[PDB]
Ligand binder design. Sequence first.
Ligand SMILES: C[C@@H]1O[C@@H](O[C@H]2C[C@@H](O)[C@]3(CO)[C@H]4[C@H](O)C[C@]5(C)[C@@H](C6=CC(=O)OC6)CC[C@]5(O)[C@@H]4CC[C@]3(O)C2)[C@H](O)[C@H](O)[C@H]1O
Ligand SMILES: CC(C)CCC[C@@H](C)[C@H]1CC[C@H]2[C@@H]3CC=C4C[C@@H](O)CC[C@]4(C)[C@H]3CC[C@]12C
Ligand SMILES: CC(C)CCC[C@@H](C)[C@H]1CC[C@H]2[C@@H]3CC=C4C[C@@H](O)CC[C@]4(C)[C@H]3CC[C@]12C
Ligand SMILES: [Mg+2]
Ligand SMILES: [Mg+2]
Ligand SMILES: [Mg+2]
Lengths: 995, 281, 32
Amino acid sequence: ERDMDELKKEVSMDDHKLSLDELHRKYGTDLSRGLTTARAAEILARDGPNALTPPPTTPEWVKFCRQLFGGFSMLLWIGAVLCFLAYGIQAATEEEPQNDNLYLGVVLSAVVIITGCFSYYQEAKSSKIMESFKNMVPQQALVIRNGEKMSINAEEVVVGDLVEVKGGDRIPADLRIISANGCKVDNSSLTGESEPQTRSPDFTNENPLETRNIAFFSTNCVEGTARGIVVYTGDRTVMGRIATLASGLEGGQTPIAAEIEHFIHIITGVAVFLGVSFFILSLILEYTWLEAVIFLIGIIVANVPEGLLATVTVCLTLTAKRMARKNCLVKNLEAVETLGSTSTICSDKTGTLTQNRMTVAHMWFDNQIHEADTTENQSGVSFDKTSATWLALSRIAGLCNRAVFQANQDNLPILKRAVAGDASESALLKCIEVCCGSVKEMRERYTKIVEIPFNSTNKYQLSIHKNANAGEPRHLLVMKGAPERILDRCSSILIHGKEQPLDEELKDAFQNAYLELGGLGERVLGFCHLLLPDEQFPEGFQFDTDDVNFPVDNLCFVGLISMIDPPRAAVPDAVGKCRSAGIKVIMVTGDHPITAKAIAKGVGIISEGNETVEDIAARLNIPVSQVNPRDARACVVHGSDLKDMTPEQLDDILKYHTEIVFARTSPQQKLIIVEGCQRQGAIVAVTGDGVNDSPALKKADIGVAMGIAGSDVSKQAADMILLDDNFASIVTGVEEGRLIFDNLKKSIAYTLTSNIPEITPFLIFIIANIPLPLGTVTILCIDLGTDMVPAISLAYEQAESDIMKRQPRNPQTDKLVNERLISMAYGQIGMIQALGGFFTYFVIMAENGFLPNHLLGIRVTWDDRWINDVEDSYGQQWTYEQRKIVEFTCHTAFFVSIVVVQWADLVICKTRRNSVFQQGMKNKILIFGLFEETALAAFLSYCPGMGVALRMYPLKPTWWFCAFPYSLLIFVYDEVRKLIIRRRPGGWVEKETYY
Amino acid sequence: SEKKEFLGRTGGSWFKILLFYVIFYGCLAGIFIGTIQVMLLTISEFKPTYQDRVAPPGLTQIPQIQKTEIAFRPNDPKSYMTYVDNIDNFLKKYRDSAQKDDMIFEDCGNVPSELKDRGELNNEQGERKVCRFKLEWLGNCSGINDETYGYKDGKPCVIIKLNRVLGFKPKPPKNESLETYPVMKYNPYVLPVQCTGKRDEDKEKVGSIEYFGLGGYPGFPLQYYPYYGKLLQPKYLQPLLAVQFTNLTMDTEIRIECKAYGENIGYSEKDRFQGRFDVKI
Amino acid sequence: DPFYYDYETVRNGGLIFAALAFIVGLVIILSK
Ligand SMILES: C[C@@H]1O[C@@H](O[C@H]2C[C@@H](O)[C@]3(CO)[C@H]4[C@H](O)C[C@]5(C)[C@@H](C6=CC(=O)OC6)CC[C@]5(O)[C@@H]4CC[C@]3(O)C2)[C@H](O)[C@H](O)[C@H]1O
Ligand SMILES: CC(C)CCC[C@@H](C)[C@H]1CC[C@H]2[C@@H]3CC=C4C[C@@H](O)CC[C@]4(C)[C@H]3CC[C@]12C
Ligand SMILES: CC(C)CCC[C@@H](C)[C@H]1CC[C@H]2[C@@H]3CC=C4C[C@@H](O)CC[C@]4(C)[C@H]3CC[C@]12C
Ligand SMILES: [Mg+2]
Ligand SMILES: [Mg+2]
Ligand SMILES: [Mg+2]
């Protein structure tokens, strides 16, 4: 299969260039009569129906398992297995862990299971809402067999049978065009070409993709009619190969998951360091290998942050919820953050950056160019329509067209409403409908007699009607066509309602105007009219298209009409915000260079003032090869050159040019550009619409498709989708992703601060041989019991500064959890928390008759069930359950004290840099975190029967206030730390602490 | 690991970091010791702050077992050496030669008598005297030289002892007492104890019970109470009560529960040694 | 007797607080 996907990454080839003789000699077909019914029915069952094999991915609900493993749920899994193993070793004697260690493993297991359940439910919900969006309407092909046209199901079409396509019809399979009349197909999705390309029987370009003798699958035919023999069917077609390639690539590891892996390696690192060093230490004193192993497992497992999976998953889920609120839907749960880490965005032009709707831009009147309103809501400026030249031109443009408003468009806005016709004809129709009034009564005002549709050669389209005016009953003739040819066929010029001959001054003014608008990226169509000598051509004269009835030369040229597809409204602002974020924007398109660069300048991918090599060569009147490419900050790379390029050349291009636009690029080349960007070691986001973006959007670190105007294949290959087709969301994304990162740290930090006061009680327990300060149940009531709500609330923290001002993070340098962070949580704050806990501990025990210095070495006799006389400092005798009750009352106050220091830890974790007096307590979820936390702890302590159940006993009032000064110390310490960090950003406190 | 110039991982500034942690952890330590010091300033030298936890005092045995079971061969010396040595080290403090001093010791009634109240909890009066306890008070079990001496060797014997609680003044059951089983009539001045095979249910019971108390009285004299603490009354000798089982079934294991009765006494079903007692033999 | 501590009043106080702070936090979450 490797060889297969090696053959799918290579651009295609074909038989497209042949004589029709050799075409049907090879295919064994009749040109006019197609094939026989029996032959078609033979080929249909020979290989397979015409359709793509349904997407190879249909994971059974057993895919649940996918969410139960990952990289972190694995750590919790081995944690649980170590727990169960430890219990197994503890079956060596009669043992308590029935209430301790087995419960610990089962709890870990429950956490993994539930987390997987939730994440899987979210992803599955996204899957469902994606399934609902699938609307597939069967479109039956019109075939021709045994001389008769039969319209049959598209999936019944075979190889090498004659097929006819008409206006609006979708191309059934890959065809070789034998004949054509006025046929413009829409290739916008497949090859990326914006304007409809004419299709002809003739061989034009060597590359089968840009040639005119081939029609492609999934392309809609704009206008005209055509006949062709089917070259390819089903999965063997072009987009079928694109789809099978896109389905056969790999997602790649997300930066977030990688950071999680690094983090895990750290935590397990200190886990086994402590475990081993303490195993050795414990063997150094007394305890046998049994007890020693028990201690090893106890520590390594204790170092595992049980609730951190839950909290992180919930966090990602929350941000994902907001993304969904903005109608930005991410297929994958961990692909939400990726945007924030993206240093380069490769975007396609048509369908993505643009509205993909051809619209009239500038016009030519009286040797003057006037810009129309190109906005969708018509919020711009209208030209001056008082001029009669505009009246004449508008009448010409409106009267000769194939464009017709379809039946059901009435209430809809004249722009966004549907039109049956060509691109140019649609734009013209809409413009004339808005500006000059209704084109209905105006088109039927003049009665069309005999018209010539745009020819295969010279492409001139003319029509001629009677006169609707009062004074002059002359026969009116109108023609539109390419500026140069109509320049060849015209003599007279119209200005301000009165004619003239052509003088080379204003003729070349017209020329330079045409080259200006053409160089501006817009496509220009020349418009002319000639009234006729009704004396020579009477009112009864019936003239046909056989010969020339009308003086094809010496016409009256009126003006030019240029058109282009505008960018979507939120696009320029979005690109600006992206460039402000430090993200490099590179347009990647298979469109023509002239339009590509223009659009790029329009949206701001290429800024004002920057010049390409060709621009410098143009201004200085020197050969293009002369100027130094280093002097060119912006570049447009023709697709022709990219095929001959090596990796070093692409690297140099990407390095030495800030504003880059790749034009006339095939899908595979898009893939190569993306991979080239990844060779630089930089995170990549790609945005596209059609199937040509399917290989790119798949391979990219994160893909982004368009909900409506995007195709199905690239929608499947994308890791993210925009439902409302709002480009601005991308900015929000890189905003969101950049924020959620910071909060995550905080979140993580918080829980990891809890482990030090969690672990140490069982540590010194082994060391100083003191009664156990902190039980297992309490610890579970901390990690999963209390800290949950604050840790989640830490996700509702906002930006501490402008996040879109800073440069994108460095994956190698900037880490999620790094040495600084551990230096903080484990090193400093957690230690103070532990001190607070042991303080409370000693307070309780000392107040009940057991002094701290006496408490050393007691546990041996203390944990003994059968010693019921145990002397405190006062000389009193304690039974087992009595002193164990005291110890259990020490557990609860230790737990509460943990909550108490977690107050201060929560507040200070709320902000990594800013002082709390700045960022404010404005987060409400945080406040409720505190209240709920305290109330929960107090409940656990004081709820009836909890001394029987969890063996948590009520606390005397004073107990509660023992942990206060340590918490205050934590707050003050981190506050002055977050002071000095602000004041001295050299900085020692900044390098060592700030995380 | 190492390159120029760093020690794994980054070793240039190590002095700064480690100094910072020395000072830091030093401050943390000092702070903790401070809080603990004030905490220790708030604790009394005479009476503990909370006595509510030990409130139902427990009953304990002289040969504390692995788990509540005396199982030994009446023949093999090495069988009961454990128990025997335990009782030896237990009653080593009670010898007539062990208490010589009339200074720190007081010769009290040969018969159970009223509670002895000495001053207050404070140090106003000096170190308090302690009543004497003669080993003769327990006959046939460890009385001086003559007999046993095998310490239950012919037939099982165990002394029961009440736990010590500061200021505790044991209240014996009223003379109106409800079904306390055969007991003597001296009830006002002593805290009583009685033993049975199984408590409230059908019994395997085989036994013959002989009690040695103060003056041959099955219970603790109140004249040894209240206990004034380790500080005010060091070398304090608490009352002891010997219980011998003469007739028993030898090769079969039976269980025995001893209960102490009184108003100041209470029992926990969860704590089997609290207020009551359990031994398998 | 010093051997009697009132755990029930302390308990009541704890639970009552719990209810108060919990419902207060509920008031905080809902900002109208
Ligand atoms: C004196 C010593 O202690 C007694 O047992 C000790 C070992 C073992 O039994 C346990 C229960 O299994 C350990 C267990 O190992 C690991 C923990 C689950 C671990 C945690 C991971 C985590 O995430 O949270 C906490 C830290 C301590 C822990 O909470 C318990 C604490 C109670 C204890 O019971 C103590 C026996 O008496 C033994 O025989 C004697 O040697
Ligand atoms: C400077 C400020 C912020 C605090 C100064 C620290 C010292 C002097 C304070 C902080 C915490 C305090 C303790 C809190 C707990 C109580 C328990 C009570 O049963 C006896 C006193 C005692 C132990 C307090 C004594 C003084 C104490 C140790
Ligand atoms: C909410 C934040 C800002 C902390 C401030 C409130 C603190 C000081 C309050 C809230 C919870 C409170 C406790 C609620 C439980 C009761 C039980 C009672 O038998 C003794 C007092 C005691 C133990 C309270 C002491 C004061 C307490 C610790
Ligand atoms: Mg992907
Ligand atoms: Mg596109
Ligand atoms: Mg933890």
